[PDB]
């Protein structure tokens, strides 16, 4: 299983609340422990941001991000505004970039556009930087494993 | 052999002994004779024929290409499928030699069962009318000729029959 | 290390005992993994086993079937020694006594009679002739300079030489005893040396005759 | 043992026969002795010197590292590799167990079959001059010297030597 | 480069990430930079990404060390404008030889 702990991000100048019908809780809502960030007002400038989570506990963390690719290139600049967007992620152990491409794809629960979602562990005492200038589902919180378990997949009642 | 007749207590075998695996060889008045016997020929015969029948055989599975002779997959997966494929052929070949070596032991020793099992039962035919050599012969007190010795291969025998005279030759 | 050390009188009457001694070190007489066994060895007769003792959850003996009527040999657990006792000998017991471990090493638990440690040796000599002291004389030195000591008219055998107590044995050579018409024995022992060094350096021959208790000292000089 | 002459109608071993595997011990006259059997032991020990020649030898195959101990690989190879390695371990555990298990059932239903046949070997030579007592031992009814016992165990006992005292002391 | 040899080579080469796009600019001047590398039988292209990683062994800048097995008479073509770091050597295998992972004395 996993215990949940607080990215401990706080944000200014940009929105929060990226909300949509495919994530539906009695109206329109979004993955509980992520958060899309937006810019401020529409066709707005997201700001060159940086944010940084270092794992102060004994065991590795396991850490979540998400690109958003729009349905289009206009939506793109909408959300975010215009210019070529970037993300960059690196750790002591890790080290790897992103440019998002929005483009028309076909239609999943009512949407175009699509998420790529990505993860690393961080260890204890490591910290991850998040690098980025739009078109990023930031996560609001890291997961650690709490012990032991086995997984099965199965189609019978327990 | 286990039981300690062929190779054993029999000293040797017969080369003119062509038409079974085990059989008998006489002496009395009428000279001499060889007879094989085929209830323990047939025997030994179908317990080998049994194995052949275990070992020579489909094994249904049916395995596909994963690498390339041609053109090499990456190393790191190229040498995961060698390691694998080696431990495999390790398997096999430890199997292989145990399976035959087994099979051998048994089947030398089946051998030796049946003439065993041949020369006992010989043995209880003519209670108190013969005494054991310990070459696999049997000394036989009374006169015995071919039609009595082929009652003995035969397994009519009657002890009954001779005993008065083979007893009181002791 | 294991340690066999024999002992024992070498001169024994006719019709007399024959008694020696193999004390143990290294190892128990009562050992499961030991058998403890007597062969004596004789220019005529060769390699002759004579018997043996262990234990295995109680004491057993086996002889050689040409001593049996005359032979014992028996464990002390006390002292970690065994025995051999041979009874009425003639001139044929003269032999070299030997003690051995068996059945140490073995095949797959069996003993298989393998003797993996001997003692010294014991010479025996079975004789009527009362012992006598050997005589010893200087063979003096008259640029390499030889020197000795002749060793003359003792019985039985065996004498031992060393030379400066055991100092110097580099070029030392003791010769096999030689049996005089007499029916004593003599031999002699020599040693090459510097000749430089006789100025300076003492020479002495150190012999010792157990039989007769005879240990003398001899100084060899120009 | 299969056979059931050690740990069966042979009461117990002895501890005193250090020299031999079998062997023979007698009571007449002249006393007590006991003398191991060597053609007998030796036919045991060259058998089970063969099993270990062949079970102790070369697995010529090499093996090379395919994971890393201080820096580790990834995970989906890695698991896929430890599962493949522990596969390998969960067989040559259970062939190793099994392979000893059958060895030793032979070994010690051998070492049976060797007794067996050396007791088999003895009747077979004073036939009708002694009868089998069911502990291992043979009553002899003639008198038999040192050099008769020595003579069944050296194998050149001659039976009809000592039939008509034998035979007749029933 | 061409392998002139019978054995395949072994050829190494390295992309540096700054720390930051100014420290890349100083390095090697500004602009969006490229390095493409070809042979017969390999086939790929990198652009560098500076940006502030934690700092190792005192440096918040990367390396990217890449790898390819050069076949005999065949080439490598290094074409590149900025952050490479480039191979001075090429290295050829000796023979045979067995790695361990040990934490023990020889
Ligand atoms: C079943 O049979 C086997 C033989 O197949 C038998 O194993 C043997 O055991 C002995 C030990 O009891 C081994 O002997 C050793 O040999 C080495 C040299 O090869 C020596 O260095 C050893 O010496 C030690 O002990 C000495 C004093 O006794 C010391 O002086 C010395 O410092 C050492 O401590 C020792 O002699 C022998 O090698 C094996 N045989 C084989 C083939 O390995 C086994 O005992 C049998 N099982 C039973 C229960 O009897
Ligand atoms: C996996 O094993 C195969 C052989 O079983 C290796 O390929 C051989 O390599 C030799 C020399 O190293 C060549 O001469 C042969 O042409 C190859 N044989 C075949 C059948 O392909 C291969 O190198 C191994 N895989 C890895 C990753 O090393
Ligand atoms: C494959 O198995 C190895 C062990 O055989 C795993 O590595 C060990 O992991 C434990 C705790 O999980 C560590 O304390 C040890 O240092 C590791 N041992 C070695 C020898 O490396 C490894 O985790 C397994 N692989 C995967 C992908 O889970
Ligand atoms: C067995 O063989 C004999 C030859 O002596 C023959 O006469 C007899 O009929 C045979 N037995 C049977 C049951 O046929
Ligand atoms: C067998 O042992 C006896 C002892 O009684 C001996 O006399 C005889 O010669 C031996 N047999 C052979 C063939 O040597």
């Known amino acids: 299983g996993i215990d949940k702990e607080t990215m401990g991000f706080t944000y200014s100048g940009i929105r929060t609340n990226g909300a949509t019908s495919a994530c539906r809780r009695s109206g329109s809502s979004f993955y509980a422990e992520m958060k899309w960030l937006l810019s401020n007002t529409d066709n707005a400038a997201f700001p060159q941001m940086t944010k940084s989570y270092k794992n102060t506990r004994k065991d590795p963390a396991l850490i979540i991000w998400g690109i958003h690719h729009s349905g289009s290139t206009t939506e793109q600049t909408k959300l975010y505004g215009s210019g070529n967007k970037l993300i960059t992620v690196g750790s002591s152990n890790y080290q790897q970039s992103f440019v998002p491409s929005p483009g028309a794809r076909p239609q999943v629960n009512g949407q175009s556009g699509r998420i790529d979602f990505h993860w690393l562990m961080l260890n204890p005492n490591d910290t991850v930087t998040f690098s980025f200038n739009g078109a990023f589902i930031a996560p609001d919180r890291a997961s650690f494993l709490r012990g032991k378990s086995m997984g099965i997949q199965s189609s019978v009642q327990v | 052999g286990l039981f300690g007749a062929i190779a054993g207590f029999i000293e040797n075998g017969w080369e003119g002994l062509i038409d079974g695996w085990y059989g008998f060889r006489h002496q009395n008045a009428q000279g001499e004779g060889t007879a094989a016997d085929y209830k323990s020929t047939q025997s030994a015969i179908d317990q080998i024929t049994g194995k052949l029948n275990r070992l020579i055989e489909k094994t249904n599975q049916q395995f596909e290409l994963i690498d390339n002779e041609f053109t090499e997959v990456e190393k790191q997966i190229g040498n995961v499928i060698n390691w694998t494929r080696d431990s495999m052929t390790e398997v096999w070949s430890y199997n292989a030699e145990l399976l035959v070596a087994m099979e051998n032991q048994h089947t030398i020793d089946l051998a030796d069962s049946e003439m065993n099992k041949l020369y006992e039962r010989v043995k209880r035919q003519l209670r108190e009318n013969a005494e054991e050599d310990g070459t696999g012969c049997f000394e036989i007190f009374h006169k015995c000729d071919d039609d009595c010795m082929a009652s003995i291969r035969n397994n009519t025998y009657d002890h009954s029959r001779y005993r008065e005279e083979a007893m009181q030759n002791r | 290390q294991v340690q066999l050390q024999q002992s024992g009188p070498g001169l024994v009457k006719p019709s007399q005992t024959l008694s020696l001694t193999c004390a143990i070190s290294?190892?128990?007489?009562?050992?499961?993994?030991?058998?403890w066994n007597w062969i004596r060895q004789s220019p005529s007769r060769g390699l002759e086993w004579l018997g043996r003792?262990?234990?295995?959850?109680?004491?057993?003996?086996d002889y050689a079937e040409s001593v049996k009527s005359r032979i014992t040999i028996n464990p002390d657990t006390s002292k970690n020694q065994f025995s051999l006792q041979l009874n009425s000998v003639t001139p044929e017991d003269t032999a070299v006594y030997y003690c051995?471990?068996?059945?140490?090493?073995?095949?797959?638990?069996?003993?298989?009679?393998?003797?993996?440690?001997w003692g010294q040796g014991t010479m025996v000599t079975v004789s009527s002739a009362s012992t006598k002291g050997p005589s010893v004389f200087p063979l003096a030195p008259s640029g390499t300079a030889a020197l000795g000591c002749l060793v003359k008219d003792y019985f039985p055998e065996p004498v031992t030489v060393s030379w400066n107590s055991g100092a110097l044995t580099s070029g030392v050579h003791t010769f096999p005893a030689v049996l005089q018409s007499s029916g004593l024995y003599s031999l002699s022992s020599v040693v090459t040396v510097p000749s430089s060094s006789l100025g300076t350096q003492t020479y002495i021959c150190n012999v010792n005759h157990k039989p007769s208790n005879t240990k003398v000292d001899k100084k060899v000089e120009p | 043992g299969l056979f059931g002459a050690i740990a069966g109608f042979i009461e117990n071993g002895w501890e005193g026969l250090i020299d031999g595997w079998y062997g023979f011990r007698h009571q007449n006259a002249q006393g007590e002795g006991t003398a191991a059997d060597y053609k007998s032991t030796q036919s045991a020990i060259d058998q089970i010197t063969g099993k270990l020649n062949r079970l102790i030898e070369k697995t010529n195959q090499q093996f090379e590292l395919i994971d890393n101990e201080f820096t580790e690989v990834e995970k989906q190879i890695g698991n896929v590799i430890n599962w493949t390695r522990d596969s390998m371990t969960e067989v040559w555990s259970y062939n190793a167990e099994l392979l000893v298990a059958m060895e030793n059932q032979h070994t010690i239903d051998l070492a049976d079959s060797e007794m067996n046949k050396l007791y088999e070997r003895v009747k077979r030579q004073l036939r009708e001059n002694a009868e089998e007592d069911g502990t291992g031992c043979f009553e002899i009814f003639h008198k038999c010297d040192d050099d008769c016992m020595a003579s069944i165990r050296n194998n050149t006992y001659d039976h009809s030597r000592y039939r008509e005292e034998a035979m007749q002391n029933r | 480069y061409k392998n002139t040899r019978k054995d395949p080579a072994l050829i190494i080469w390295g992309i540096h990430h700054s720390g930051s796009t100014t420290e890349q600019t100083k390095l090697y001047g500004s602009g969006n930079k490229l390095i493409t590398v070809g042979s017969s039988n390999y086939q790929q292209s990198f652009v560098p990404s500076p940006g502030a990683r934690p700092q190792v062994n005192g440096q918040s800048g990367r390396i990217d060390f890449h790898w390819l097995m050069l076949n005999p008479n065949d080439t490598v073509t290094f074409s590149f404008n900025g952050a490479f770091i480039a191979p001075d050597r090429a290295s050829f295998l000796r023979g045979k030889s067995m790695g361990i992972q040990s934490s023990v004395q020889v």
């Open positions: 051995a471990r068996s059945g140490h090493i073995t095949v797959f638990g069996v003993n298989v009679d393998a003797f993996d440690m």
């Open positions: 290294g190892d128990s007489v009562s050992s499961y993994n030991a058998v």
């Open positions: 003792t262990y234990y295995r959850s109680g004491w057993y003996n």
